[PDB]
């Protein structure tokens, strides 16, 4: 009906009891622009709305509302690739709107025809330190944990450029046979970097294959959270109807987390630990839900969320909850970056717990899981030996440890390091693993069965 009040950016409507839940309402403001808002909650003879464009202009008696009568749903086309959108899917280049062939729900709770077949075939991201150690399977969602003090935007970028150049490597491996498409969603990221993302798609020649949703921080909070839901829904349509391998790259979760946090400052719903909502978990889980093998089991959606730790620790609420919903984690680190390493990836807390089962010898090798296991134990000792080395002197060193100190550096500067443009064969990756291990006797090995070792070493 009309504004009773506005409390924070949240706008308090006084209105008669009829609307749908998540029903779009259009607020008529006196300035030549009408705007849409969604009822966040519906209550007894009032509804609290956060208006999707702007944050100012609402008046007491100079406002009018009319109920659209329809809750927000994303209008989906599979012709949506090769178009530039914003966070509401409106054009910024004038002309390419989302348009439709079907209308599907933004939550993806109605359809949810996610297959009960567990991640199957191999995926790589062309970065050796990712591929071998925490090996990606289709439908597997494994987070990229980063920290600021980093060119963390450059690491995300690298993965976006690399995605789709990997795919002929994968065809040959027989972990892909079908088209590859990219769904790209941006939330609260710098101007320069938004041009880097467009440019990386352009180079690849996959601009046609990708959709860009661009959302800045000067576009509202509620609207920020909707953006990946639009993207996600379109990916689900790609994966289900046309049996495609869909990669959605969703950056930046941190920006998404803040937005959730700013709200509930006038809701009846109350915020829990560290001022984060307690149903923050619930919010993450809605995003995360569209990910997994689709029914038809020739398509899948693989999802890579990008998280920068804003405080740097991994026990901060943003990473801690995410790591739990996902199956393992991938750690980027400040320390490698300082020495002068790119892409700087620490592997010591990095483990994916569903890695072994997915992969098999037919597109990897049987030693892929064994050779990875050896390299973690040796790297771990090398790291403790280093810390002790500083404090006491070379008094606590032993033969294995001196060897381990060299191993650390060897691995860091040959294995993990590679150019932005560079991409890597998995089979190649595995010969370079063996090479590093060749400086240790075989009697000191034990995370590999003696049968397996004898064949490939």
């Amino acid at each position: 009906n009309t504004v009773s009040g506005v409390n924070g950016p949240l706008v308090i409507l006084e209105k008669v009891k009829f609307p749908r839940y998540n029903e779009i309402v259009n607020l008529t403001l006196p300035d030549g622009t009408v705007r849409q808002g969604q009822v966040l909650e519906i209550r007894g003879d009032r509804a609290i709305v956060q208006v999707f464009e702007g944050t100012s202009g609402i008046d007491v008696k100079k406002t009018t509302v009319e109920f659209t009568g329809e809750s927000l749903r994303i209008p989906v086309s599979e012709d949506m690739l090769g178009r530039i959108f914003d966070g509401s899917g409106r054009p910024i280049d004038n002309g390419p709107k989302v348009f439709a062939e079907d209308y599907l729900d933004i939550n993806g709770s109605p359809i949810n025809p996610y297959a009960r077949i567990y991640p199957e075939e191999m995926i790589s991201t062309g970065v050796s330190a990712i591929d071998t150690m925490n090996s990606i399977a289709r439908g597997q969602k494994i987070p990229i944990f980063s920290a600021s003090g980093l060119p963390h935007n450059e690491i995300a970028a690298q993965i976006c450029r690399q995605a789709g150049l990997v795919r002929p490597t994968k065809d040959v491996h027989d972990g892909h046979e079908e088209n590859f498409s990219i769904v790209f969603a941006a939330m609260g990221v710098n101007l320069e970097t938004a041009r880097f993302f467009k440019q990386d798609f352009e180079e690849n020649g996959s601009l046609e294959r990708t959709s860009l949703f661009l959302n800045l921080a000067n576009d509202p909070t509620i609207e920020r959270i909707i953006t990946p839901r639009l993207a996600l829904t379109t990916a689900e349509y790609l994966a289900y109807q046309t049996e495609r391998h869909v990669l959605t790259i969703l950056t930046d979760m941190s920006s998404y987390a803040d937005a959730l946090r700013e709200v509930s400052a006038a809701r009846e719903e109350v915020p829990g630990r560290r001022g984060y909502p307690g149903y923050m978990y619930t919010d993450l889980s809605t995003i995360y839900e569209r990910a997994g093998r689709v029914e038809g089991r020739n398509g899948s959606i693989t999802q890579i969320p990008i998280l920068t730790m804003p405080n740097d620790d991994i026990t901060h609420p943003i990473p801690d909850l995410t790591g739990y919903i996902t199956e393992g984690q991938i750690f980027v680190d400040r320390q490698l970056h300082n020495k002068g390493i790119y892409p700087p990836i620490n592997v010591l807390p990095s483990l994916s717990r569903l890695m072994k089962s997915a992969i098999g010898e037919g597109m990897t090798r049987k030693d892929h899981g064994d050779v990875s296991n050896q390299l973690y134990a040796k790297y771990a000792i090398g790291k403790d030996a280093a810390a002790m080395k500083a404090v006491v002197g070379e008094e606590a060193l032993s033969i294995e440890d001196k060897l381990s100190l060299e191993f650390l550096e060897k691995f860091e500067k040959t294995f993990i390091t590679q150019g932005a443009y560079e991409d890597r064969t998995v089979f190649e990756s595995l010969d370079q693993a063996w090479s590093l291990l060749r400086i240790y006797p075989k009697e000191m090995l034990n995370r590999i069965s003696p049968k397996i070792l004898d064949e490939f070493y």
């Binding site: 007894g44 567990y118 307690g278 978990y281 889980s285 984690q329 973690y376 134990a377």
Partner: protein, 593 residues
Amino acid sequence: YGAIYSVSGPVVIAENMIGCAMYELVKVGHDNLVGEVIRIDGDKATIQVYEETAGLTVGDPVLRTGKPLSVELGPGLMETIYDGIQRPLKAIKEESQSIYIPRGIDTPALDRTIKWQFTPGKFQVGDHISGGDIYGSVFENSLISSHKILLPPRSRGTITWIAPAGEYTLDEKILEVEFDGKKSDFTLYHTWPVRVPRPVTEKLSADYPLLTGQRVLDALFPCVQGGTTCIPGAFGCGKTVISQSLSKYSNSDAIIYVGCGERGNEMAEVLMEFPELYTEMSGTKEPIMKRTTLVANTSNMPVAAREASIYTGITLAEYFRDQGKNVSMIADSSSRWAEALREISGRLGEMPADQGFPAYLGAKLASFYERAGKAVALGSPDRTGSVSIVAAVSPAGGDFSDPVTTATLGITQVFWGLDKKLAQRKHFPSINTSVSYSKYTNVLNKFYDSNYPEFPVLRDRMKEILSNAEELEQVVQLVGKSALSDSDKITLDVATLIKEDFLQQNGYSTYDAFCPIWKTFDMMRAFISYHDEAQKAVANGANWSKLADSTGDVKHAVSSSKFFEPSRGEKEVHGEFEKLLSTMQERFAESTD
């Protein structure tokens, strides 16, 4: 009846809810969503609605059904996968064409087309009857036809009608009970509230060991059927691999696998893996499946379901317990249930005071626990049934200082560690004697004494070798090694052997599908004998180095033990390990002089 006052998140509030209680089953809206009145504030009831909202308006009716929210336990539970609200997942796949539950769609709690073979109980006409007494039985699978049809907990009377043997539906009545006037007619299914502990003849103290099938779990502190256990996780240390692996390897009559609030990929894995693999009970035609009743919740589905998960799950263990079936309930992970509880705490608007976590959290964790245990089965013919609760605990913030873990350790009597540093190094599951205890130990080693083994003696020495190693390692790190006693070196060396053969095993031991107690005992027995001979050997004079060099052949042989499988001696006692003891004695002879 009621008129919707407000819809905030998937929480619906409805005014005009009188002659209503606080666990009522309700149909919410004009959409007829399944729902439950958790609490009430005056006239206004706060209802958790188990299907999502996206279009439910204010002022739609709310109809109370006139009874609590319960779950259905009948026949056909086995060899089918259900959710945590318990609607068949499989039936959902064909009819809705949606693999996972669709919104606005409702399906009743069990399949209503399936027919079962009823065979008569041990009652006839005009007989006095009571609850948990066996009214019949249904041949439910091929592995097990042990599915006893009981008169419900909290029922007594005289049976007016006993139907004869034959084929019936589970909606097609076969029993009438008269208590004072018609109590109700009964069918194959029976209803049970998921908010109450299921009645029992008596609880009995646990004293019968289950063998996990994992040598390491038996070796330091034995599992018991009827018990409570914590296994630490961290969400990237292969906690899933060992959960699913334990489930296969442990052997009970019925097993209930409860995914609390999971990846969805992990749940999918178990659904696929189990009919492909075999039982050790000689199960056929989808072996493991026939033995399991599976509760599948992902975290991406509604938070109500995920609350409901554990409770439905415990009631399923308990139902089978009254029949005289011994149950293993593996619930994974209890920390995700707590995360759902923190969610409810903030959505209704109840106070959190357990470190940013619920008021109720500590008590709800205990309530779940007390429903597990060993008992004399419900009903008077007397059977033994038991429930062992294996509940995974894992971080919800800190490493063990999170609320979940603090509460659980209080109440658990069995705890088996898992160290992160050894996990990354691949030596999981790692049980640390400082981060592990069993209070069941003393009754359990005396049980194994009756069974044949010397077991209690081996326990003390196993403990001693691990125990001194941790303290000597701290001197090693700081001071270094330039000296470390002849005795101290020996302890370190032997402790490595124990790590490698026992603690490390999960797709690295070619036999691990089920490991007997005798074999574990025989393996550990060689390790301990090697230890005592070695320490005596340095003291009666003989260098440490000469002693390593001469032990030689046997030392490797114990190193290699882990791959070896029963194939010599008995079916549980292994000759290679028996041979080993005597050869060891000969090595000592060469080594001292």
